[PDB]
DNA sequence: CGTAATTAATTAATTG
DNA sequence: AATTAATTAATTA
């Protein structure tokens, strides 16, 4: 097998590399890498190195990395461009791995761990690490074992050994319910004192040094805590042994009185799973406790205990250790499902960056582009300083607020990267400019044809057609990868719905789930077999389909983010190929494409239909159009339909056979009009939406831009077994909306679109009757807590203090002089509740850290002073008022 | 050190 | 309540 790197670092004039060799064995080497950079040279100098603009460059080979770096500084001061990859580890990696990397994950040491620290005086700050580490569980991917380091004796208590027997038993049975599938994988090690525990953990770490270090919050708690505790007890050089090169860097953050740190461990790539989850999951969560995320992703129960966590070891060491192990295993479970580590390795190795650089689209693209250009013996430009400037983006149509009964939407395939490729937008493909007519004139095809020679964008930019830009070239490759995974995801999704259909009529038999790969559409033979399966076999198959869909979702949506990020990167001053003309070309072409196709669809739909000048396109946003289908249904006649699936079939056929071909012809004209390099504006039907046939449901509605709801029966080829609500922007979608309110408003929308006005009125009353009985957490608002210090005036709200900060300031006054009540962390999320006037908290609202029961000392008071009336009006009634007024409905029977 | 467009909620001040 | 502006948070794309 071909070699691949694990980690790369620059220490002085040396590159330190851990790698897998041709026999699949982990190795380390130190290389005195001699880098190269380039300067522009007179034409009269024969060479093989040119910049992206085809200007001649001469290579300077340096004795070592410091002198290359020194050369750059020198070139800045003179004002002469120093060209080349100035990040030397990428340059090194590009030389040492002169090929598409094929990697083997089973050889990569992936490690997650977490630690427990008992603290009788509040949060144990990693920067002081003054309390003993009393448990560590460290899972090693290569061994596939959980190494459990348990402290038996501590200042805060001497405890008995942990029983794997009791651990294994379910909680019903008085056990700890450690999943049976990992029981046999636990290697348990108790210790007499903290010193040998830590010493043994160090040697262990030396034997089994992580390449990928992960876990939950490990970068901000576990890593810095372990590092500092070992430092205090043993000394810094001993703590440096966590780096396989005995080098670390401590980053210090703020913070008036507060101080937290982040350790960089040279020779390891840290991918904190919270950070992976925030970047790659495409959710926004009310809370980021592992308990909250585990429940969300895996549907597992919260890790319940009695007393505060600072007394859990003391009172129930057994559960203390079991919960430590499970916590570690839950992250593993989440990744088994989400597959983010895998995604990181894929992207990292494709780009030839340090794996931890996947968090950075700019860094990622810089390497991809560098490698792509290096292969052709071309030289990359030097990074330049730019001022930050606002620039124009997408077009959003103003909709008429209303109910819309039948709606078909259409959306463009991967729009921005498609524009990049169609127009040939790249730093080196710029050809010139033309005189700019109003966008409106290009939309209406009345403006003069910009160029007969070059590929054009309505912002005035012209690009060469006769060669390919590095940006179109490299975005195309990732796009194709994205396309493949999306294919796998949609088939998995379609397969899911087939299984869902089959669950309506489950057969009474004893059978097994079928052995199938879900990334592929079921064969007819398979579909026949599915119709004779039992619910048990069907339900298990469904779970597997859904799991396959999720993996395909991860793979496709993150590749989409990467490619869409290149379009954005053109507008970030830190990107080497930053150019606002190129960013503008993309967005302005986009604005044209959408409005252009709006005109074309209306024109078409007026011809068929036999109408004159009706606006069929009700709404659009960036790359999408929403088409009122009422008149399409009208022509054939609503009474002509047997059931819902009949008119859904009808519209589906009409879009596929009539609309898409008319749209394609429309965009081919535009491409010719802009003289583009390649036609790639592909717009296909997305949603078919409407009320169930024969019902009083309204089907859908808009309140304004970026705010609507649709009852969808078919989504880009997936025919649902049950209609799904497509709700965008509305409070049902916002993480700041109370949990119970999100559900109530969703059922409200469901009744409106599927059942009608009378049904809505029934639910409203029922919810209102039950509101005061719901759990206070489920009805609390949520918000991020930024700038708490800015508005804190002696514990009281300063000028312009936001409601949610006011709440935090009310919290902080309530918990003064109290050690074991949890503190609100700057930047984190908080639950928020209104308080009735005359409350003893002295203010109108209170806030406490999200994902946690409010501390017992004031829970009783908060529950009693909650303003349910304000709460209901603010979070539930006001949003519904907006939905219903837009849809011309009443939530209460009007007098 | 991917982007812009857009909403809703809330504070301050003003609307004779 | 009802604006206009400014800030903050959170979406859609
Ligand atoms: C989601 C997203 C979209 N956009 C812009 C660029 C997209 O091409 C355009 C349309 O967004 P989308 O339609 O959401 O995505 P897409 O067209 O790029 O990909 P798909 O094939 O699944 O439809 O909006 C961003 O700039 N950043 C983003 O994060
Ligand atoms: Ca814990
Ligand atoms: Ca799209
Ligand atoms: Ca059946
Ligand atoms: Ca879209
Ligand atoms: Ca599509």
């Amino acid at each position: 097998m071909k070699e691949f790197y694990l980690t790369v670092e620059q220490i002085g004039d040396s590159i330190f590399e851990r790698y897998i060799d041709s026999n699949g064995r982990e190795r380390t080497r130190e290389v005195e890498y001699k880098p190269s950079l380039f300067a522009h040279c007179p034409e009269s100098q024969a060479t093989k190195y040119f910049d992206i603009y085809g200007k001649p460059c001469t290579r300077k080979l340096f004795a070592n990395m410091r002198d290359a770096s020194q050369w750059i500084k020198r070139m800045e001061d003179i004002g002469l461009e120093a060209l080349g990859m100035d990040d030397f580890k990428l340059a090194y990696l590009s030389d040492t791995y002169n090929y598409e990397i094929k990697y083997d994950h089973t050889k990569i040491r992936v490690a997650n761990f977490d630690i427990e620290v008992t603290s009788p005086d509040g949060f144990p700050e990693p920067s002081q690490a003054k309390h003993p580490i009393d448990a560590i569980t460290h899972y090693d991917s290569i061994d596939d074992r959980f190494y459990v380091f348990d402290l038996l004796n501590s200042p805060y208590g001497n405890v008995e050994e942990w029983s794997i027997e009791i651990a294994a038993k379910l909680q019903e049975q008085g056990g700890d319910e450690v999943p049976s599938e990992i029981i046999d994988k636990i290697i348990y090690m108790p210790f007499d004192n903290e010193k040998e525990l830590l010493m043994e953990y160090l040697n262990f770490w030396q034997q089994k040094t992580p390449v990928i270090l992960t876990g939950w919050n490990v970068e901000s708690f576990a890593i810095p805590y372990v590092y500092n505790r070992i430092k205090n007890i043993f000394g810094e050089s001993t703590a440096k042994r966590l780096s396989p090169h005995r080098k670390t860097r401590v980053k210090v953050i703020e913070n008036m009185y507060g101080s937290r740190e982040i350790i960089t461990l040279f020779g390891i790539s840290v991918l904190d799973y919270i950070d992976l989850y925030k970047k790659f999951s495409f959710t926004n969560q009310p809370s980021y406790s592992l308990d909250y995320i585990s429940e969300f992703e895996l549907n597992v129960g919260k890790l319940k205990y009695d007393g505060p966590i600072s007394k859990l070891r003391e009172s129930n060491h057994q559960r203390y250790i079991s919960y430590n192990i499970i916590a570690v295993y839950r992250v593993l479970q989440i990744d088994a499902k989400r597959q983010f580590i895998n995604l990181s390795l894929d992207m990292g190795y494709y780009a030839k960056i340090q794996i931890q650089s996947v968090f950075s689209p700019i860094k990622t693209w810089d390497a991809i582009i560098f490698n792509s250009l290096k292969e052709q013996n071309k030289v990359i430009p030097q990074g330049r300083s730019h001022p930050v400037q606002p620039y124009p983006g997408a077009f959003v149509k103003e909709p008429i607020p209303n109910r819309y009964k039948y709606v078909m939407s259409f959306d463009l395939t991967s729009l921005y990267p498609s524009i990049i490729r169609q127009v040939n937008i790249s730093p080196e493909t710029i050809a010139g400019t033309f005189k700019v007519a109003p966008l409106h004139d290009y939309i209406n095809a009345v403006a003069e044809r910009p160029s007969d020679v070059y590929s054009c964008s309505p912002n005035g930019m012209m690009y060469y057609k006769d060669r390919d830009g590095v940006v179109p070239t490299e975005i195309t490759k990732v796009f194709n990868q994205r396309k493949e995974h999306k294919g796998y995801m949609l088939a998995a999704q379609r397969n899911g719905e087939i299984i869902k259909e089959a669950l309506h009529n489950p057969n009474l038999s004893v059978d097994e789930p079928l052995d199938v790969d879900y990334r592929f559409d079921f064969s007819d033979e398979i579909k026949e077999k599915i119709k004779k399966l039992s619910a048990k076999s069907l339900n298990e198959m469904l779970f597997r389909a859904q799991r396959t869909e999720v993996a395909g979702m991860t793979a496709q949506i993150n590749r989409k983010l990467l490619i869409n990020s290149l379009a954005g990167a053109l507008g970030n001053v830190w990107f080497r190929y930053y150019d606002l003309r190129n960013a503008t070309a993309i967005t302005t072409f986009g604005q044209m494409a959408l409005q252009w196709i709006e005109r074309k669809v209306n024109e078409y739909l007026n011809e068929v239909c036999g109408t004159e000048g009706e606006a069929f396109v009700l709404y659009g946003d960036t790359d999408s159009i929403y088409v009122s289908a009422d008149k399409i249904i009208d022509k054939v006649g609503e009474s002509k339909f047997r059931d819902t699936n009949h008119w859904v079939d009808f519209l589906d056929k009409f879009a596929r056979e009539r609309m898409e071909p008319a749209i394609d012809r429309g965009f081919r004209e535009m491409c010719e009009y802009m003289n583009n390099k390649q036609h790639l504006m592909f717009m296909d039907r997305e949603a078919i939406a409407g009320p169930p046939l024969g019902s009083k449901g309204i089907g859908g509605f808009w309140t304004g831009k970026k705010r609507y709801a649709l009852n969808v029966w078919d989504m880009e080829g997936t025919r649902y077994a049950e209609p799904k609500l497509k709700i965008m922007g509305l409070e049902t979608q916002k993480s700041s909306t109370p949990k119970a309110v999100q559900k109530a408003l969703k059922e409200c929308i469901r009744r409106m679109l599927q059942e009608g006005e009378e049904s809505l009125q029934e639910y409203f009353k029922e919810f209102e009757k039950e509101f005061r009985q719901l759990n206070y957490i489920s009805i609390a608002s949520v918000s991020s807590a930024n700038n708490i210090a800015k508005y804190d005036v002696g514990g009281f709200p300063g000028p312009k203090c936001p409601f949610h900060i006011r709440g935090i300031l009310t919290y902080n006054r309530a918990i003064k002089g109290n050690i074991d009540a949890p503190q609100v962390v700057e930047g984190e999320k908080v639950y928020v509740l209104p308080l009735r006037e005359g409350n003893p908290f002295g203010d109108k609202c209170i806030a406490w850290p999200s994902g946690t029961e409010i501390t017992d000392l004031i829970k009783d008071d908060v529950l009693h002073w909650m303003d349910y009336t304000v709460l209901l009006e603010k979070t539930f009634i006001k949003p519904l008022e907006g939905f219903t007024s837009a849809a011309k409905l009443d939530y209460e029977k009007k007098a």
Side-chain angles (χ1 to χ4, degrees), chain A residues 417-486:
Chain A
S418 295
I419 299 177
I420 280 167
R421 293 165 70 213
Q422 167 155 341
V423 186
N424 209 43
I425 303 163
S426 207
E428 82 285 28
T429 53
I430 297 152
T433 68
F434 60 90
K435 205 178 84 156
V436 283
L439 191 79
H440 177 267
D441 288 329
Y442 295 111
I443 289 158
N444 289 312
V446 295
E448 62 183 302
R449 195 157 177 256
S451 174
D452 185 60
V453 174
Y454 306 111
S455 181
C456 291
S457 173
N459 73 326
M461 292 292 293
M462 308 199 293
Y463 304 86
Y464 296 115
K465 291 174 77 180
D466 63 66
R467 26 71 150 74
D468 290 69
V470 70
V471 164
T473 289
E474 292 310 303
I475 214 176
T476 294
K477 291 166 183 173
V478 182
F479 168 71
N480 284 330
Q481 289 158 47
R482 187 264 174 148
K483 188 180 173 180
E484 187 188 319
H485 295 285
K486 201 203 169 151

Side-chain angles (χ1 to χ4, degrees), chain A residues 18-37:
Chain A
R18 300 175 66 192
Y19 69 103
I20 297 300
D21 74 359
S22 71
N23 298 315
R25 290 158 180 169
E26 198 187 321
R27 292 225 207 105
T28 316
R29 60 189 168 206
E30 187 190 326
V31 188
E32 285 151 288
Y33 177 68
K34 297 207 267 212
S36 296
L37 299 171

Side-chain angles (χ1 to χ4, degrees), chain A residues 114-117 221 305 309 320 323-324 327:
Chain A
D114 195 23
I115 78 176
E116 308 295 334
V117 179
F221 183 73
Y305 49 85
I309 222 274
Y320 192 76
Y323 286 177
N324 180 238

Side-chain angles (χ1 to χ4, degrees), chain A residues 411 623-624 686:
Chain A
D411 144 283
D623 83 322
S624 69
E686 200 150 60

Side-chain angles (χ1 to χ4, degrees), chain A residues 206-466:
Chain A
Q206 245 82 316
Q207 287 281 304
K208 304 180 203 299
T209 305
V211 171
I212 305 305
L213 195 56
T214 186
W216 198 257
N217 222 272
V218 296
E219 208 192 82
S220 47
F221 183 73
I223 295 152
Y225 201 99
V226 163
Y227 183 84
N228 269 293
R229 186 76 189 158
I230 295 180
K231 194 234 87 199
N232 297 346
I233 292 169
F234 292 98
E236 185 149 55
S237 68
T238 302
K240 285 177 176 298
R241 283 171 53 191
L242 286 152
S243 160
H245 314 316
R246 320 284 168 256
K247 187 183 162 65
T248 62
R249 175 130 81 247
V250 183
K251 287 195 225 148
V252 192
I253 290 271
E254 315 186 73
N255 188 17
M256 326 152 296
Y257 313 98
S259 186
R260 49 223 181 274
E261 48 193 63
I262 285 90
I263 317 302
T264 297
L265 304 176
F266 284 84
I268 302 170
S269 293
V270 178
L271 302 175
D272 193 334
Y273 212 91
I274 188 168
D275 294 328
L276 283 188
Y277 191 97
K278 285 164 170 190
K279 207 201 159 56
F280 299 138
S281 75
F282 290 84
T283 62
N284 200 359
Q285 301 290 7
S287 181
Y288 293 94
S289 73
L290 183 56
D291 277 344
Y292 194 96
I293 306 292
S294 302
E295 161 99 50
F296 183 97
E297 295 292 322
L298 309 162
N299 295 231
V300 294
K302 207 218 78 152
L303 271 23
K304 181 230 78 192
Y305 49 85
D306 285 312
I309 222 274
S310 58
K311 287 180 186 182
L312 184 56
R313 192 186 161 261
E314 178 186 51
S315 61
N316 201 346
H317 171 259
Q318 185 52 50
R319 193 150 276 189
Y320 192 76
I321 295 304
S322 285
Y323 286 177
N324 180 238
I325 297 157
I326 290 165
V328 167
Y329 178 49
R330 272 168 181 202
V331 184
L332 287 168
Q333 285 175 112
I334 296 169
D335 196 59
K337 179 194 183 205
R338 290 290 200 151
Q339 289 172 200
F340 294 148
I341 303 283
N342 169 73
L343 166 71
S344 297
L345 301 155
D346 271 355
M347 276 168 62
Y349 281 118
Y350 180 87
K352 301 191 193 172
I353 57 184
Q354 304 188 106
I355 306 305
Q356 74 263 24
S357 284
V358 296
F359 292 109
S360 176
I362 281 162
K363 174 57 77 166
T364 299
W365 284 111
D366 197 43
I368 288 162
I369 295 169
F370 161 58
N371 280 288
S372 182
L373 290 171
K374 162 164 176 285
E375 277 299 306
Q376 300 171 263
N377 291 333
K378 291 172 185 176
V379 179
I380 75 175
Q382 190 181 7
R384 283 157 161 90
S385 176
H386 306 269
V388 175
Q389 278 177 306
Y391 70 96
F395 174 77
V396 186
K397 190 175 173 73
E398 191 78 56
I400 302 159
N402 211 348
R403 60 176 75 185
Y404 299 89
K405 187 173 176 174
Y406 297 106
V407 177
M408 309 198 73
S409 64
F410 289 85
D411 144 283
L412 281 148
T413 282
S414 181
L415 183 60
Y416 282 12
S418 295
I419 299 177
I420 280 167
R421 293 165 70 213
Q422 167 155 341
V423 186
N424 209 43
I425 303 163
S426 207
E428 82 285 28
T429 53
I430 297 152
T433 68
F434 60 90
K435 205 178 84 156
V436 283
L439 191 79
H440 177 267
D441 288 329
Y442 295 111
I443 289 158
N444 289 312
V446 295
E448 62 183 302
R449 195 157 177 256
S451 174
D452 185 60
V453 174
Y454 306 111
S455 181
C456 291
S457 173
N459 73 326
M461 292 292 293
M462 308 199 293
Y463 304 86
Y464 296 115
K465 291 174 77 180
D466 63 66

Side-chain angles (χ1 to χ4, degrees), chain A residues 623-729:
Chain A
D623 83 322
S624 69
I625 58 171
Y626 291 78
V627 177
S628 196
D630 293 8
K631 287 168 173 76
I632 321 295
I633 306 286
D634 280 354
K635 269 206 91 71
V636 296
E638 218 182 67
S639 288
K640 270 73 159 186
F641 296 112
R642 295 185 287 102
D643 50 26
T644 303
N645 207 59
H646 195 200
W647 68 258
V648 172
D649 269 344
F650 173 65
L651 297 175
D652 187 20
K653 189 160 192 174
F654 178 66
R656 183 163 42 257
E657 292 196 334
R658 309 287 190 145
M659 291 197 71
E660 281 167 22
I663 285 151
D664 294 342
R665 269 197 306 281
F667 277 127
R668 288 201 287 278
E669 187 186 326
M670 200 187 77
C671 165
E672 203 69 36
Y673 188 50
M674 289 289 143
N675 187 32
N676 299 136
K677 187 185 206 295
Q678 184 179 8
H679 162 57
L680 300 158
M681 297 292 109
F682 306 146
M683 171 181 273
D684 300 303
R685 193 267 293 170
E686 200 150 60
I688 304 173
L693 217 215
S695 67
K696 284 144 289 189
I698 66 173
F701 75 83
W702 265 256
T703 80
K705 296 180 172 188
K706 300 187 180 284
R707 280 178 69 85
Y708 61 96
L710 293 171
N711 190 53
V712 179
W713 301 85
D714 197 285
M715 188 66 175
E716 60 200 322
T718 297
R719 190 64 61 83
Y720 301 125
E722 291 300 327
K724 174 186 130 60
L725 304 178
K726 188 189 164 78
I727 312 181
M728 312 310 293

Side-chain angles (χ1 to χ4, degrees), chain A residues 502-507 530-533 538:
Chain A
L503 278 153
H504 299 333
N505 288 106
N507 288 58
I530 291 175
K531 292 177 173 199
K532 288 163 187 175
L533 283 173
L538 285 172

